[PDB]
């Protein structure tokens, strides 16, 4: 009714700030890129050209020039190797490993068995999920003081679900949502999924997100 | 707001930043590897077949020039870039001059014409040079504010103004500076009271 009309409106303004902030982003990069890969790539222009001119007039210098070109091609693509490494993102496969290591070295038993694991989930969600995960684990090896920790990750419905439970005690007060907690929620929620918790026996984190 | 705000910020930031890396690799990858290949192949045929070699290098120049342009168009549109470069340029010159550079980004510019940005850059650089030329001051305050419609640099130095009473000789950056701001319908003023003080103004647009 009235509530539907005013949600449509609320979505329109969200999106509007979206496009704007994404733009400002396109930019930080515009400066870095231009600097580096721009001087270099203009130089590639010039040596290309100059090489073509000297092919006959002087095939020696021509060659030497092409040597320098290939050099700068390669290293430039190397710069973007160093660049799409960033925000390329971690895949859970990797985050699970990381955490198995952190839990072992925490003095804690890591309970797992690969259960109905994920396919054709957006790479992005994979990053977020990776994050919340790492944070949850840290919280546990920070306060729970549990000695064992169960975890499963399943493709339920059209929605993916991690669950991370620890036998320790939840050291938090009644409203310590002050911190990777508010962080976690804020996140999943923005991805239109959910985060839930139970301090019944130790601490239990259910993260959910849309997949299929 | 402290965090709902700039947390959802930094998250759409990362949303599209992953998208942006997939586009780098996609576009400039394919392209730049192809540049590798044609470079190489060109070197091989320089003699065996200098014709094909040339043709290959033509296609190379095309691509190298082309890749920069997509990024470049965004850069031309973007504002505040000229001033930032100038600040970096002058901070360096002042440091290396033996001089303290006083600054704090104060109500800095948005949607000023790119042109005015260049002019202002200029007068600025010239002002600085004059200081590190004659003022022999040891510290130098500078601010750049968006005052109402009009933008204003102010560049002050504690040294002494070595100039005579009417040192505004043409072809010197003084007559040059005025000539300029004034042609842009803004203004230039100075005070030799304590050291030297330059107020540049111009229209924001
Ligand atoms: N798995 C767990 N076991 C026991 N206590 C936990 C827990 N997860 C969170 N807590 C408690 O809840 C409170 C809030 O945690 P939150 O995640 O906001 O910050 P933190 O203490 O984990 C450090 P950071 O915010 O840097 O990760 C903490 O005071 C912590 O002791
Ligand atoms: N900030 C400053 N401090 C002290 N003296 C200054 C000054 N700016 C200018 N002057 C004096 O006024 C004169 C005019 O300076 P101006 O910058 O107009 O010409 P210039 O001597 O720098 C050569 P150019 O043509 O390269 O600018 C200078 O010769 C100098 O003696
Ligand atoms: Mg935490
Ligand atoms: Mg001068």
From Swiss-Prot, chain A:
Catalytic activity annotation: ATP + protein L-histidine = ADP + protein N-phospho-L-histidine
Main location (coarse class): membrane
PTM-bearing positions, type Phosphohistidine: 34
UniProt GO molecular function: ATP binding; identical protein binding; phosphoprotein phosphatase activity; phosphorelay sensor kinase activity; protein dimerization activity; protein kinase activity
Record has Oxidoreductase as a keyword: no
Cellular compartments annotated: Cell membrane
EC number: 2.7.13.3
Enzyme superclass (EC): transferase
Membrane topology: Multi-pass membrane protein
Keywords linked to the UniProt accession: ATP-binding, Cell membrane, Kinase, Membrane, Nucleotide-binding, Phosphoprotein, Transferase, Transmembrane, Transmembrane helix, Two-component regulatory system
Record topology, Cytoplasmic segments: 1-212
Signal peptide positions (record): none
Any one cellular-component term (Gene Ontology): plasma membrane
Chain ranges of the Histidine kinase domain: 32-212
Functional note: Member of the two-component regulatory system DesR/DesK, responsible for cold induction of the des gene coding for the Delta5 acyl-lipid desaturase. Acts as a sensor of the membrane fluidity. Probably activates DesR by phosphorylation.
Protein name (record): Sensor histidine kinase DesK
Species of the source: Bacillus subtilis (strain 168)
Full-sequence range covered: 155 to 368 of 370
Curated annotation (Swiss-Prot), chain B:
Ranges per topology, Cytoplasmic: 1-205
Recorded topology in the membrane: Multi-pass membrane protein
Superkingdom to which the source organism belongs: Bacteria
Reactions the enzyme catalyzes: ATP + protein L-histidine = ADP + protein N-phospho-L-histidine
Keywords tagged on the record: ATP-binding, Cell membrane, Kinase, Membrane, Nucleotide-binding, Phosphoprotein, Transferase, Transmembrane, Transmembrane helix, Two-component regulatory system
Enzymatic class: transferase
Subcellular location: Cell membrane
Record carries keyword Phosphoprotein: yes
UniProt name for this protein: Sensor histidine kinase DesK
Underlying gene: desK
Residues shown, of full length: 164 to 368 of 370
